[PDB]
Symmetry: none
Subunit: 54 residues, 2 copies
Protein backbone atom coordinates (compact mmCIF):
# COMPACT_ATOMS: atom_id res chain seq x y z
CA UNK A 1 0.00 0.00 0.00
CA UNK A 2 2.98 2.26 0.69
CA UNK A 3 4.59 4.11 -2.21
CA UNK A 4 1.48 3.93 -4.37
CA UNK A 5 0.38 6.59 -6.86
CA UNK A 6 -2.92 6.60 -8.74
CA UNK A 7 -4.98 3.42 -8.50
CA UNK A 8 -5.71 1.43 -11.66
CA UNK A 9 -9.40 1.19 -12.54
CA UNK A 10 -10.94 -1.63 -14.57
CA UNK A 11 -13.48 -0.99 -17.31
CA UNK A 12 -17.18 -1.73 -16.85
CA UNK A 13 -18.21 -5.34 -17.38
CA UNK A 14 -21.58 -5.85 -19.02
CA UNK A 15 -24.35 -3.28 -19.34
CA UNK A 16 -27.58 -4.06 -17.52
CA UNK A 17 -30.36 -5.45 -19.71
CA UNK A 18 -32.54 -2.89 -17.94
CA UNK A 19 -31.48 -0.40 -20.59
CA UNK A 20 -31.35 -3.00 -23.34
CA UNK A 21 -34.87 -4.12 -22.43
CA UNK A 22 -36.35 -0.62 -22.65
CA UNK A 23 -34.56 0.21 -25.89
CA UNK A 24 -35.43 -3.16 -27.38
CA UNK A 25 -39.04 -2.88 -26.26
CA UNK A 26 -39.59 0.42 -28.03
CA UNK A 27 -37.26 -0.76 -30.79
CA UNK A 28 -39.56 -3.66 -31.64
CA UNK A 29 -42.45 -1.22 -31.88
CA UNK A 30 -40.67 0.85 -34.53
CA UNK A 31 -39.82 -2.13 -36.72
CA UNK A 32 -43.20 -3.70 -36.03
CA UNK A 33 -44.97 -0.54 -37.15
CA UNK A 34 -42.66 -0.29 -40.15
CA UNK A 35 -43.39 -3.89 -41.06
CA UNK A 36 -47.10 -3.14 -41.18
CA UNK A 37 -46.27 -0.16 -43.40
CA UNK A 38 -44.41 -2.38 -45.82
CA UNK A 39 -47.43 -4.56 -46.23
CA UNK A 40 -49.55 -1.43 -46.25
CA UNK A 41 -47.74 0.18 -49.18
CA UNK A 42 -47.47 -3.15 -50.99
CA UNK A 43 -51.19 -3.59 -50.43
CA UNK A 44 -51.83 -0.19 -51.98
CA UNK A 45 -50.62 -1.33 -55.41
CA UNK A 46 -52.39 -4.66 -55.03
CA UNK A 47 -55.76 -3.07 -54.26
CA UNK A 48 -55.33 -0.04 -56.52
CA UNK A 49 -54.15 -2.19 -59.43
CA UNK A 50 -57.67 -3.50 -59.97
CA UNK A 51 -59.32 -0.72 -57.98
CA UNK A 52 -60.73 -3.36 -55.65
CA UNK A 53 -63.53 -1.97 -53.49
CA UNK A 54 -63.18 -1.91 -49.70
CA UNK B 1 -32.99 -31.20 4.52
CA UNK B 2 -34.02 -34.64 5.75
CA UNK B 3 -37.06 -36.32 4.19
CA UNK B 4 -36.84 -34.29 0.99
CA UNK B 5 -37.79 -35.54 -2.47
CA UNK B 6 -37.21 -33.66 -5.72
CA UNK B 7 -36.13 -30.04 -5.37
CA UNK B 8 -38.36 -27.28 -6.72
CA UNK B 9 -36.80 -25.22 -9.51
CA UNK B 10 -37.77 -21.64 -10.33
CA UNK B 11 -38.25 -20.44 -13.90
CA UNK B 12 -35.70 -18.25 -15.66
CA UNK B 13 -35.90 -14.54 -14.88
CA UNK B 14 -35.16 -12.23 -17.79
CA UNK B 15 -33.40 -13.15 -21.01
CA UNK B 16 -30.08 -11.43 -21.65
CA UNK B 17 -30.23 -8.49 -24.06
CA UNK B 18 -27.21 -10.12 -25.67
CA UNK B 19 -29.62 -12.16 -27.76
CA UNK B 20 -32.15 -9.37 -28.02
CA UNK B 21 -29.40 -7.02 -29.23
CA UNK B 22 -28.24 -9.33 -32.01
CA UNK B 23 -31.77 -10.14 -33.16
CA UNK B 24 -32.80 -6.49 -32.96
CA UNK B 25 -29.66 -5.37 -34.78
CA UNK B 26 -30.31 -7.58 -37.78
CA UNK B 27 -34.03 -6.99 -37.32
CA UNK B 28 -33.62 -3.27 -37.90
CA UNK B 29 -31.73 -4.03 -41.09
CA UNK B 30 -34.64 -6.02 -42.51
CA UNK B 31 -37.23 -3.34 -41.78
CA UNK B 32 -34.79 -0.62 -42.81
CA UNK B 33 -34.19 -2.31 -46.15
CA UNK B 34 -37.92 -2.89 -46.54
CA UNK B 35 -38.61 0.75 -45.80
CA UNK B 36 -36.32 1.79 -48.63
CA UNK B 37 -38.20 -0.66 -50.85
CA UNK B 38 -41.50 0.96 -49.99
CA UNK B 39 -40.21 4.29 -51.12
CA UNK B 40 -38.55 2.54 -54.03
CA UNK B 41 -41.75 0.99 -55.36
CA UNK B 42 -43.72 4.15 -54.63
CA UNK B 43 -41.05 6.07 -56.50
CA UNK B 44 -41.46 3.77 -59.47
CA UNK B 45 -45.01 4.97 -60.15
CA UNK B 46 -44.01 8.56 -59.46
CA UNK B 47 -41.14 8.52 -61.96
CA UNK B 48 -42.81 6.22 -64.48
CA UNK B 49 -46.06 8.19 -64.38
CA UNK B 50 -44.46 11.02 -66.34
CA UNK B 51 -41.56 8.91 -67.58
CA UNK B 52 -39.19 11.31 -65.84
CA UNK B 53 -35.61 10.88 -67.07
CA UNK B 54 -32.88 9.83 -64.64
Amino acid sequence: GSKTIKNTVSVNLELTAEEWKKKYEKEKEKNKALKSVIQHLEVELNRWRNGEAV
